[PDB]
Structure formats: C-alpha cells, structure tokens
C-alpha cells in the first residue's frame with residue numbers, strides 16, 4: 001500500500017496475543033514498543049531522542065506482523081509514549097520512502 | 100527518488116543559503132533542526148519526544164529545499180539529537196511510505 005503523511009502513519013501490528021497500533025518510523029533505527037511483559041532473554045540498553053534517553057529491554061528474534069507482512073528481529077521494550085516500527089523491520093516488509 | 104531503509108534516510112537540505120544534512124523522519128510531526136540562526140520573528144514553544152520535553156524556537160513560513168524539492172513551512176530550532184524533517188514538510192514535497 002501507499003501511506004500519505006497528512007496524519008501519523010499508524011498501522012496495526014501483532015506481537016503475540018497483542019494487536020497494537022504502531023508508527024512506521026523512518027527516523028527510528030530500531031523498533032521500540034510500549035511496556036509489555038515478553039518472554040525470553042533480553043539485554044539492557046539506553047536509546048536517545050528528543051528530551052533525552054530512556055532505558056529499554058532488548059529482545060532478539062521476536063516475530064511481529066505489520067499490516068499482514070511478516071517480520072522478525074530485535075524489539076526494544078520500554079517507557080516510550082508510542083509504539084515505533086523502526087528501520088530494522090521496515091526493510092523486512094519492503095517499505096520505502098518515495099517522492 | 101525511491102529511498103530504501105537499510106541506511107538512515109539522510110538528505111542534504113538548503114536553508115538560509117546553508118547546506119545541512121537532515122533525517123527524513125516519518126515518526127516526527129514537526130521539523131526540528133539543531134541550534135542555528137534564522138532570520139525573523141520566532142515564538143518560544145515546547146515539544147515532546149521519546150525522552151521528555153525540550154524548549155524550541157518556532158520559525159514560521161521558512162523555505163527549505165529538501166533533496167531538490169521546495170518546501171515553505173514551520174521549522175523548530177532546539178536541542179534535537181539530529182536535524183529531522185517531519186511530516187509538516189514531508190507532505191509538502193510529496194513524500195509517501197510504500198510497501
């Protein structure tokens with residue numbers, strides 16, 4: 001599909017039983033999800049944006065479905081105000097910027 | 100152009116006759132540039148990102164040429180970690196997400 005940017009590019013994602021709305025975000029290197037209790041091993045990390053840094057949990061090889069497209073990779077979980085689909089998964093579902 | 104996302108979508112912009120590198124950032128509502136001088140009136144504003152809130156200077160109706168495409172709109176200047184082109188200007192240059 002083609003998504004215009006008049007509004008926030010929010011789409012439905014699925015990670016486990018949870019359907020969530022997430023931002024398709026070309027400005028995010030990594031995928032950052034709102035706090036959720038995922039199973040598995042993880043590593044601590046700090047990621048920075050406007051306002052400063054937040055502490056997140058890095059989970060690897062987590063399957064996620066983004067608008068019916070399958071992806072699998074690293075997901076960062078922490079106190080973000082919005083679910084963010086970053087470039088690590090955007091490439092997997094074939095997402096490009098066009099103008 | 101079509102821009103893939105295995106690398107950060109960095110482009111050269113021209114603003115006030117200066118060339119800068121900026122990130123095409125679909126997860127940003129607003130365009131936020133690092134500390135710089137711009138002419139004309141500005142208004143103090145606050146914006147929130149992943150790490151909390153910052154103070155910015157809001158300049159309205161500023162021309163920026165983004166990868167050869169002309170925009171004229173709001174530019175916020177403040178302590179962003181990197182120059183970001185947000186949806187307010189991405190829409191002006193006809194940028195969409197496609198997958």
Ligand SMILES: CC[C@H](C)CN(C[C@@H](O)[C@H](Cc1ccccc1)NC(=O)O[C@H]1CO[C@H]2OCC[C@H]21)S(=O)(=O)c1ccc(OC)cc1
Nearest residue numbers: 027028029030047048049050126127128129147148149180
């Ligand atoms: C260093 C570049 C950029 C600022 C990074 N951000 C991605 C943004 O797309 C972020 C994504 C974002 C969106 C909403 C809330 C928090 C973050 N947007 C953002 O801060 O936009 C601000 C400017 O316009 C306004 O509209 C939205 C907030 C304001 S981020 O969320 O902080 C971020 C995401 C993933 C990362 O992985 C390493 C690292 C940082």
